[PDB]
Ligand binder design. Sequence first.
Ligand code: HEM
Length: 94
Amino acid sequence: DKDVKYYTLEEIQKHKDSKSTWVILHHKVYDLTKFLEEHPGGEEVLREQAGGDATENFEDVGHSTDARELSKTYIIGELHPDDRSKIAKPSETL
Ligand code: HEM
C-alpha cells in the first residue's frame, strides 16, 4: 500500500514511556497512549510491553477478533518490513 507511513522499532523505542507508549502487534503498530484509558485491560499491561513485541503478551489473552478490527480506529501506521524481519515475525509469519 501507499500513503501509509512505515515506522521502525529503533524509532518506536523512543516513545517507550508513559507519555508516549507504543506497542507492535500483528506486524502492525498502533497508538496505545490514546488507548491507555480505553483498554479494558489497564495501562500497566500495555506499558509492561511498551515499545516492544507483545505478540505473546497479546495472543496470551487471545485478543478477540473484534479487536483486530477495532484497532483500525486507533491506527497509527505500519511496521517497517525490515523491522519485522528483525525478530522473525511478530504474531504469525507465513
Ligand atoms: C501489548 C498490548 C496489550 C496487552 C498486553 C493486552 C492485554 C489484555 C489482557 C490481559 C486482557 C484482559 C484484561 C486484563 O487483565 O488486562 C485484554 C483484553 C482486551 N483487550 Fe487488550 N491488550 C493489549 C492491547 C490491546 C489493544 C491495542 C486493543 C485494541 C485495539 C485491546 C483490546 C482489548 C479488548 C477489547 C479486551 C477484552 C477481551 C474480550 O474481548 O473479552 N487490547 N487485553
